[PDB]
Symmetry: D2
Subunit: 392 residues, 4 copies
């Protein structure tokens, strides 16, 4: 049998976008209220309050009404001005990518770059900051998804704070699926969104903003105002007694309301544990069957995405196509410089359940063996299952 | 009895946002596919095709992934260069508002402004173009929603074309509810969205772009690129064989797919007829009960929104609060200059049905009379019913 | 304009079936669990518990997995045996109809019948019971929907209890929309369902059963067992630790779960008040415009359905067809002996909001005037609105 | 980690009820129309038409408004008269169970019974019919689900027809998942439903009735009439111009409409192929890991359910509890005689995808090994994968 390309697949195991929880999809179907209806104004405020609790924030997070590249570009546009000297940390596609926006807003850019299977070394950061007291803004990506690797953002953020610089963090593919919060890493801007670990639909940005960052952006004549790129316009929009700069994405807010309830009701630590367990089982299976996890070390592998290195000689695009056509299972490609180098399996929200690692392993192994590899698929399943069974 | 502010209303008859069609709300609940899943790639392409058909476009419209203020800003940012001379037409809040974006991108701004219950005279546009042959871009709003009035964009567009200038049209609150299409007004950029007359939730922009406008933007090195404000980056994104600049709003695209199906299936002409008949009945009722339609003349009143002038000594905010608390019926406030001066009843998508005009008239009359007016509410209902019956 | 028969209508104001609440329709879309999954077993038990609370029952109500004619036939089949002498009370289609099932299960049938716009007189019942000590079972309909009239079931039930007979009550179209509960009327069998006042989808029966009724049915060799008509088979099925005689209607149970939450959260007295207010406004409008409420007296008119007498000469079928074709509003026909005599407007669940009485009045009046009547429609709306505005 | 009993599972792989298709679940959420709304009358007619097409029927199938035990009981009540001589075929719980209903309606009952992992031999049916030419009705179950075994109903039906007798077929758990149709087995009553292979929720019966069976039932004065057990009352109900005996399950009909669309759109042959391939892979895996399929031979194993024999000393209930608590995967118990003796994995509608067999094998192996077995789980997965790959 073969799954047609036009027909829906059986299981989507991708690393962004990902399927939303069934309850969230139902929440999307709530009646669309007028945004100035008192019931919507109250809902919006309570959604911001739930995001605040979720992010363990001392102040309100900002919801912006586009998907997280909006938050990222808006942060650069608003926080970085030509007087700033930016240190950009790049260990992957998003880290490197942020430097391009930084350079659009200040000519002064320094970078620490490591190959796209590695993590940024906090000692390298401490040294760079000591050598360059002129540094005023530092940007970092927590989970650089196209590599499935994690940077030590809490240590980095502490170093950056001691230096006296502002920190911009991309936690789009980490928040909700592992222990991380704006104040854990001393973030001045902390960008996340609904459609990775939180299992909500795509199209919103959730942003932690420090009081210090508010003052810098509001002072900056070059910060976007009356613009889709404006963070400053949205400062007070959380309040039931305040207007919306432009019409919010009402249905997405309904979905996010449900997703926040699910997260908080299940308990963040329980949610993080099942992300990590699913990823750990996946990695054990990949290694046991004869494949390699992309990450330079197991310690930096993401608990929300496993990136599997393509064996030299295998056509990675054809591999993913075979996994869908033969088994109905959809994996993520790489992106930019990781495209063709690896395959990604998301473990995010509804797919952060260990049984999906079992499905992923079987489809990935079967596809690989159809490409002429001779993987020990059975051994891989048994190794993944041993991890699940060992979990205390 | 009284409807609590915290609880949902019974009927929302607002002018943006508005309730989506129940079929569309169910469409939002579809499983969220990977955007690079071939089934989603196909779907996205087919949605653009359905958009092209609905908009009667000779080329592909662009879908942008933000609500229509994104399209308006991006159009100004991409089409207006610093050597352009822009003529902005302002008959209300959105028209006037656009001139601020124009001025951002060219210091050369001319304007025709009329009172905010009037429409732009095509003869005034012709006189201005004769006086200023250096004009290269003209911008206009079709339905300036906070006023509930309509500009003669097809007449205006013919004169803009006669002068060899580019036309930017905001048809956000008119497209799908009346006969209007990019071709009809010779628009170079035509901006609309799905959450007014089309009955889908907020969050997307549908933009008609002329081949001439494509050439102008592509040649403009200041036109946004690698930006949420970029139109040019999305040029080829409609195609199943091409990437997305950033992640599309998958669930919104699912809703839009359904909305376009409903519009095309019902028949655009039949859709426009019921919008216009609902508005016509509403206006007849408003006048018969002793209230005044805001519009300076009936000929310029929108078939998609009726604005009713607030009588002297009536608190408009209290009036809307009373209509909801007493009857469970929600109306729109004005915006900017019209805030506090008028009340808006939307006739859009699901609410473009004459029976909703009857509900509206009753709730509006009831709230007015509770504020001390002495309206002939029964006469209002009979006049609106006569309008409906005369069309039967 | 005209609404095609094949296309969906705008507002459904019928008296059974009726639209379900939006939340309930969403609840219908929950994943279908295995019925022996512990989470479903628990859900089922908590649904029975919520029905118990709703019905103010001292013991568990029984949910049967077909629409309420199942409960009615099952009650006759199980409780009535040939030794019984049944007094059937008939003031309408369902009351009379029950006598046919009674006669199937005992040859001994006595009846009190009144014309189908009247209510049963408790004095007539007291007299009949005194004259016939042999009576052992009495059946009564609370709201005989096809007439829109209410019987005094609490007084009747007390008389029946004093006699020492069993009482069977049909409260299908009354429970949830007015003050009524099994123990208010000393019911031995009290049959209701989800899809009238409770705003849940059709296909289940909720049944209050007295301990005395349990003992009579379980003793009866002729009571259905291993049958769709079996009540006795389902006695213990409420418990998470017990099996289901046959597979329950899982999705309907999901919907009922949500409907019970809505009812209990809003508060039963508040729900009943808005049913009554909507009906009261409707009746005021009908009378003021020049039509007649079917009920012999206002005191017996249902707060959950208004039946409007067809003017002699008017084609009632054509009237309903015109109301839908012209205004998109759907009314109920009569049934059996009330078919052609009256039109029904349901005020049930989501349609028990006074603004819908306003819509109903306008469509009914407009349709009537298209049939050549000369109703004072405006006067009717003003009378309905006065009732709403007077409500303290 | 452990999945709480109170919380939802991750994957349900049961044999009835089963999860519905997500499109069907959204279909259940359609607005509930009045059943006499012309749009619903049309829809109901078209659903019966789609049912006729799917069932390859020369006449209209009857939809009854109760889950399929209603169809089975009603078929016995209507087709079997007291002078009929019934031959009941029993190879499991449902087959044996039907004889109890037959005996209710005729005292003349003959039976062929085989062990509950075997199938009925068509030659034994031929021998019995020769021995008892007075036989007038024969009843048989196609897939006796609690055993996961299949009877040769087409062979049996040809011999029943050769003897001039009527055939009643239970195809509740086979229709839509394998090649089977009323015509194929010369059935006079053919009972199925939508909540197995068709992936709609429980609550309806779809019944094929031969013209000969119609004549027999209509002439039977004991066939239920004015009863939820009545088939004859529903004879003309399919028609948009005819009434419904009682209120149809509107929302279920909405779901069925969608389910039939999915089945016809995908292609019945393609649907049957993936059921059979999923079951075949499951059986290969079960055997390879060291477990036994219940069925006496592979040739009689159902392509829609695999039953796995419980090893000596394994608590089957604890096993299912372990599979859910450890892996979030839900299996079916046996029923009656097979309860405690086997575990069932359904391959039905949405779960008839080979990747689910992989999830099933892993959860089943894992739970077995936690109960002290020493299964070759990896060998199991590879055998199931080889089956999938051989069909590719
Ligand atoms: Cl996101
Ligand atoms: Cl919009
Ligand atoms: Cl009901
Ligand atoms: Cl079924």
């Amino acid at each position: 049998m073969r799954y047609p390309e036009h027909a829906d697949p059986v299981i989507t195991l991708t690393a962004g976008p990902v399927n939303a929880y069934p309850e969230v999809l139902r929440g999307l179907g709530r009646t669309v209220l007028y945004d100035y209806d008192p019931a919507f104004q109250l809902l919006y405020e309570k959604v911001v309050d739930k995001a605040q609790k979720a992010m363990r924030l001392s102040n309100k997070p900002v919801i912006l009404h586009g998907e997280p590249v909006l938050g990222l570009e808006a942060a650069a546009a608003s926080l970085i001005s030509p007087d700033d000297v930016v240190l950009n940390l790049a260990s992957g596609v998003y880290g490197k990518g942020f430097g391009y926006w930084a350079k659009r807003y200040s000519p002064h850019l320094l970078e620490i770059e490591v190959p796209y299977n590695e993590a940024i070394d906090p000692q390298a950061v401490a040294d760079m900051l000591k050598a360059h007291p002129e540094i005023t803004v530092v940007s970092v990506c927590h989970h650089d998804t196209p590599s499935g690797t994690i940077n030590p953002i809490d240590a980095i953020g502490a170093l950056v704070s001691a230096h006296g610089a502002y920190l911009i963090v991309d936690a789009v593919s980490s928040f909700g699926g592992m222990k991380t919060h704006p104040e854990d890493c001393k973030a001045d801007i902390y960008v996340t969104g609904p459609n990775k670990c939180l299992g909500a639909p795509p199209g919103l940005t959730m942003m932690g903003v420090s009081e210090r960052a508010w003052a810098k952006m509001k002072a900056n004549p070059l910060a976007p105002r009356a613009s889709m790129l404006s963070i400053v316009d949205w400062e007070n929009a959380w309040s039931r007694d305040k207007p919306f700069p432009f019409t919010p994405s009402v249905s997405e807010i309904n979905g996010l309301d449900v997703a926040l309830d699910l997260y908080l009701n299940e308990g963040p630590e329980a949610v993080w544990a099942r992300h990590a367990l699913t990823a750990k089982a996946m990695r054990a299976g990949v290694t046991a069957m004869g494949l390699s996890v992309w990450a330079a070390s197991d310690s930096i592998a993401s608990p929300t995405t496993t990136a599997v290195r393509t064996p030299d000689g295998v056509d990675e695009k054809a591999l993913r196509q075979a996994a869908r056509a033969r088994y109905g299972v959809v994996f993520s490609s790489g992106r930019g410089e990781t495209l063709g180098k690896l395959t990604r399996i998301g473990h995010m929200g509804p797919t952060a359940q260990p049984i999906y690692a079992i499905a992923a392993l079987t489809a990935l192994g079967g596809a690989m063996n159809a490409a002429g590899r001779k993987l020990a698929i059975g051994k891989g399943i048994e190794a993944a299952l041993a991890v699940i069974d060992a979990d205390a």
